[PDB]
Design a protein around this ligand. Structure first.
Ligand SMILES: Nc1ncnc2c1ncn2[C@@H]1O[C@H](COP(=O)(O)OP(=O)(O)OP(O)(O)=S)[C@@H](O)[C@H]1O
Ligand SMILES: Nc1ncnc2c1ncn2[C@@H]1O[C@H](COP(=O)(O)OP(=O)(O)OP(O)(O)=S)[C@@H](O)[C@H]1O
Lengths: 375, 54, 100, 327, 54, 109
């Protein structure tokens, strides 16, 4: 005679699940009913402090006021250039916040997917190690730099033919540090106005001033950097002054603190030789079109998830190919598996690699000017 | 500007312009420029004047 | 005996679908009468190319042009109504009325 | 024989506390959902924008009258569901985030979606037959079976180029794949990307690709890519800028960073030689598919395809007709 | 004063701001209005109208 | 005062050091934020700097920009000509030749 124990325990557990999943959502909605008594607070900024409790302020949508804090708001921490909160009705200061974002920063900052580490890439081991010495070190420890006593360097630029995985290398960086990446495509900065470009640059740079270990990556900088000639196009005046926004605020009065800039271009020639002086960017390091061992190693990276057999003629694929990126190897391996899927090879024959080398090497009829060598 | 004794005209940061009775508290010459002055929320009258700003 | 004349930039009026409302008006005056002729001219500002980026501007033209494709041909075709369209270019038109 | 007595007194207490569970639900929901319907039925509840979102859970609201309102208590959403730079609906009096607006698109993006989807059954394409085969294998099967790729483990393809003479048929694949595959079709022309309005085509590219991100079976038919696809110069005082901004934004938004197989990119140019080396390379457009001039029988075939629904007397020799058509 | 008394009876009968329509949702009326100048709005109707002709 | 030289001679470095040595109220701005939308906006910025300058002291106040906002080409109706005009006229008309007791040595380079 013990079934009533289970016949009450199961009902107690199920009614407890009901009461928990219902009454807890009911307590959250009770907190929402309490939030129905919560007031929207005015955004604004201190203009200047006059007395111990009078504070000259200005609404960002309009008027100007002299008001006071609550009781414990740490008035000393209000310094002109801080973003504060005001009451709606009595208009008294309720809070100060860390500064704004203007969410164009958000929609390219936290859009970033983390990647695999540098195990995906290869044939740039010199670039891996040396660019590691110019990127990774002073946030691991900045004090071997201070054991010798020298200020750490600032930044670099990647160049060569387009698409070799300059940005994929930055992705391998974006998988390594995993800390504070701001990666901007760096051409949409001109909206339709004049100083809004500069203002967004300032907003990102004060975000980099607030947060310590920041990383900056800009791509296709030819649109935004450009070259200074005598003034022709009025739509290049803006690019010259935006470039001077870069010329100051990559050095500034205050030098940056752990704010690394990483750069990657398709042509570094058209950049102004005011930007080619070191200190700002330390060295322009080259990523090349691969060699035999480079093609072989990145190919064997791409030869991984393949239902192959004892047929893989590595040397014919690498030697019958005459300059092909990691993504060109994606093209060749992908379409070799496609030629397998052409007439449905559930396995992978090697002879389709020859067909893919045929197709892509014949497709290279279309691409000239294979270099832009800086300085 | 001031029309007469202790009653004057102030524009505002609310958008429009107003003509206000001002107290004898502020000294009668402290209002030469368009100086930073203090008004009332509800009933719009001068309390104090601050000479610097900006 | 019938004819109506309509310049394109007559529809430059500053409310959304007002030009589309006059497309409604012209197509519901067309079916009242038999063997009639509305005439079209300056059909570039009426719109043939779907120019767009993230602006949201000259869109009454856009929805009016969609209303034009809708009531023009497709969904109870024309009958005893013929309308000529005048231009200097077959270059700035739509491939949806170049629907062959 | 008293464990059942304690458990049945606890079951009467379970009915009591379950009446209390239903009480804390429904009786409190009287107040809550009554006044939350009533706050939803205050107005068309003053749509607005979140500027940022903090967690000291705390949000800043800008109205659609461009007036700002912080709150340290958000309300009827969660901090993860919203994100800053969103359309949001806010009470006029309490200034409270109520509900998210489902209007997060543009205007001529919604006009860009070709809704008619005209019919091209595969009788019509004649002479491009191996192009039909390579085309289906490189585009339609990415829409159907990624199992067919990654059970052999390679990749799905990344764009295909349709080029040849401007008569031999580039419109054919557009209407054919739109009518025969049942994915979400979207097209794109070239002078659309030619704008007097500076600095806005990046919004077109990124917002159309977010549209493709949220309408995942996304055929995107780029047409006349060689309009803005032009091989670059390095001159002085000669040339515009924003065409290169839109072109390079399409490039850096397609390749370089953030890849996605929720996009399918179909471009079709007449000529190829004007195009950049960066517009193709091997992840921009994977394939380089030239089109044959219709040899003899392809001319006869398509000429009969146009004469399918017309009255044709059988005294017609198509090989004679198409064979005395040269070029 | 040819209708002055009825004009002293239309003072409790006054409604209907101008408010051009942008668009709507689906499955329901649920329209969307800008007034003129202020803002935008996602509106719903009073009950004694025709949801067809909106 | 006016400076020139190739990029990389430590151009801001002198301004850094002279800001360090001095006692005065080293108000700094930079140049490329002067190009802004509303009427006389950057001109209002220059007058804010000058009125606050004459309010503080003739102590030392600082600006560091010359290039491409104030070129000698007055004569072009080619874009932002309201802004180009107000910047050029503001620079000259607040230069004035002199103000004689304010804003010691705007250094341009
Ligand atoms: N199978 C076909 N059916 C109908 N028209 C065809 C066919 N093949 C070719 N054409 C004609 O070929 C011409 C051009 O075809 P398309 O190349 O698709 O036009 P398009 O859209 O201008 O392509 P572009 O200019 O290269 S981006 C038109 O006059 C078409 O009618
Ligand atoms: N002569 C120098 N010797 C050593 N380091 C120097 C020297 N000049 C500048 N620096 C370094 O660069 C910083 C200051 O350089 P800047 O004065 O900003 O040059 P610059 O102003 O950026 O050049 P411009 O303005 O683009 S022409 C110092 O903090 C040092 O780190």
């Amino acid at each position: 005679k013990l079934l009533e124990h289970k016949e009450i325990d199961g009902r107690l557990k199920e009614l407890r699940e009901q009461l928990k999943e219902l009454t807890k959502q009911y307590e959250k909605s009770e907190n929402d009913l309490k939030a129905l008594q919560s007031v929207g607070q005015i955004v604004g900024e201190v203009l200047k402090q006059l007395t111990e409790e009078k504070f000259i302020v200005k609404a960002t949508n309009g008027p100007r006021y002299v008001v006071g804090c609550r009781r414990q708001l740490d008035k000393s921490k209000l310094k002109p250039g801080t973003r504060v909160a005001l009451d709606m009705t009595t208009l008294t200061i309720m809070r100060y916040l860390p500064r704004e974002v203007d969410p164009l920063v958000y929609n390219m900052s936290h859009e970033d997917p983390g990647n695999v580490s540098y195990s995906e890439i290869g044939g740039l081991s010199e670039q891996i190690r040396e660019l590691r010495e110019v990127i990774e070190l002073p946030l691991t420890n900045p004090e071997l730099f201070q054991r010798v006593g020298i200020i750490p360097p600032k930044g670099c630029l990647l160049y060569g033919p387009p698409g070799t995985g300059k940005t994929l290398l930055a992705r391998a960086v974006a998988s390594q540090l995993d800390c504070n990446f701001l990666k901007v495509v760096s051409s949409s900065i001109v909206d339709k106005y004049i100083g809004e470009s500069a203002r967004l640059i300032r907003e990102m740079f004060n975000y980099a001033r607030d947060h310590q270990p920041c990383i900056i990556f800009m791509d296709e900088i030819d649109a935004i950097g450009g070259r200074r000639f005598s003034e022709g196009t009025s739509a290049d005046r803006e690019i010259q002054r935006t470039l001077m926004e870069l010329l100051n605020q990559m050095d500034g009065f205050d030098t940056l603190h752990r704010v690394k800039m990483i750069m990657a271009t398709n042509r570094p020639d058209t950049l102004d030789p005011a930007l080619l002086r070191p200190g700002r960017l330390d060295r322009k390091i080259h990523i090349d079109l691969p060699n035999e061992q480079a093609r072989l190693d990145i190919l064997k990276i791409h030869a991984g998830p393949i239902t192959k057999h004892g047929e893989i003629d590595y040397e014919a694929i690498v030697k019958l190919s005459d300059g092909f990126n990691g993504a060109d190897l994606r093209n060749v391996c992908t379409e070799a598996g496609m030629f397998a899927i052409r007439a449905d090879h559930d396995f992978v024959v090697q002879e389709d690699f020859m067909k893919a080398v045929r197709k892509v090497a014949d497709s290279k009829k279309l691409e000239s000017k294979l270099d832009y060598k800086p300085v | 500007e001031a029309v007469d004794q202790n009653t004057a005209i102030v524009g505002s940061t609310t958008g429009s312009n107003y003509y206000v009775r001002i107290l004898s508290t502020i000294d009668r010459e402290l209002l030469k420029p368009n100086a930073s002055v203090a008004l009332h929320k509800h009933s719009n009258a001068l309390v104090d004047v601050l000479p610097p700003e900006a | 005996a019938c004819f109506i004349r309509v310049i394109g930039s007559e529809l430059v009026q500053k409310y959304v679908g007002e030009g589309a409302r006059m497309v409604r008006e012209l197509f519901e005056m067309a079916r009242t009468k038999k063997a009639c002729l509305i005439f079209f001219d300056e059909i570039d500002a009426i719109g043939g190319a779907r120019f767009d980026d993230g602006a949201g501007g000259d869109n009454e033209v856009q929805r009016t042009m969609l209303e034009l494709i809708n009531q023009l041909d497709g969904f109870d075709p024309r009958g005893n109504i013929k309308v000529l369209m005048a231009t200097n270019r077959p270059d700035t038109l739509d491939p949806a009325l170049m629907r062959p | 024989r008293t464990r059942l007595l304690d458990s049945e007194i606890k079951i009467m207490k379970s009915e009591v506390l379950r009446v209390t569970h239903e009480l804390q639900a429904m009786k409190d929901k009287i107040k809550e959902n009554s006044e939350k319907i009533k706050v939803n039925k205050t107005l068309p509840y003053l749509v607005s924008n979140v500027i940022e979102l903090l967690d000291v859970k705390c949000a800043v609201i800008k109205t659609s009258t461009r007036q700002t309102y912080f709150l340290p208590v958000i309300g009827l959403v969660d901090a993860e569901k919203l994100k800053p730079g969103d359309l949001v609906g806010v009470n006029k009096d309490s200034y409270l985030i109520l509900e998210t607006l489902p209007t997060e698109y543009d205007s001529r993006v919604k006009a860009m979606e070709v809704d008619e989807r005209p019919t091209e059954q595969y009788s019509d394409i004649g002479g491009l037959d191996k192009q039909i085969q390579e085309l289906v294998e490189a585009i339609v099967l990415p829409m159907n079976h990624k199992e067919k790729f990654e059970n052999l483990g390679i990749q799905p393809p990344k764009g295909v180029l349709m080029y040849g003479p401007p008569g031999t048929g580039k419109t054919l694949l557009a209407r054919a794949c739109a009518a025969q595959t049942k994915a979400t079709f979207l097209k794109l022309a070239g002078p659309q990307l030619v704008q007097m309005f500076i600095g806005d085509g990046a919004k077109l590219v990124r917002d159309a690709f977010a549209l493709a991100k949220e309408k995942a079976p996304s055929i995107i038919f780029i047409d006349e890519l060689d309009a803005i696809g032009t091989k670059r110069f390095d001159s002085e005082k000669a040339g515009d800028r924003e065409v290169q901004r839109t072109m390079l934004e399409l490039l850096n938004q397609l390749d370089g960073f953030q890849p996605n197989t929720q996009v399918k990119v179909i471009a079709a140019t007449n000529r190829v030689d004007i195009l950049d080396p960066a517009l193709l390379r091997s992840g921009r457009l994977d394939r380089k598919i030239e089109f044959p001039m219709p040899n003899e029988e392809a001319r006869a075939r398509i000429m009969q395809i146009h004469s399918r629904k017309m009255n044709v007397s059988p005294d017609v020799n198509y090989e004679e007709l198409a064979r005395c058509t040269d070029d | 004063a040819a209708d002055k008394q009825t004009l002293q009876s239309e003072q409790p009968l006054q409604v209907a701001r101008c408010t051009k329509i942008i668009n709507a949702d689906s499955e329901d009326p649920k329209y969307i209005i800008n007034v003129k100048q202020f803002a935008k709005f996602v509106v719903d109707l009073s009950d004694q109208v025709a949801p067809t002709d909106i | 005062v006016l400076m020139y030289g190739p990029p990389g001679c430590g151009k801001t470095m002198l301004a850094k050091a002279v800001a360090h040595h001095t006692t005065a109220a080293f108000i700094r701005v930079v140049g490329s934020e002067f190009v802004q939308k509303y009427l006389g906006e950057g001109p209002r910025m220059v007058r804010d700097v000058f009125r606050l300058a004459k309010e503080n002291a003739p102590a030392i106040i600082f600006i560091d920009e010359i290039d491409a906002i104030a070129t000698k080409r007055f004569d072009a109706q080619t874009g932002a000509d309201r802004e180009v005009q107000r910047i050029l006229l503001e620079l000259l008309n607040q230069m004035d030749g002199f103000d004689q007791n304010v804003n010691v040595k705007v250094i341009m380079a």
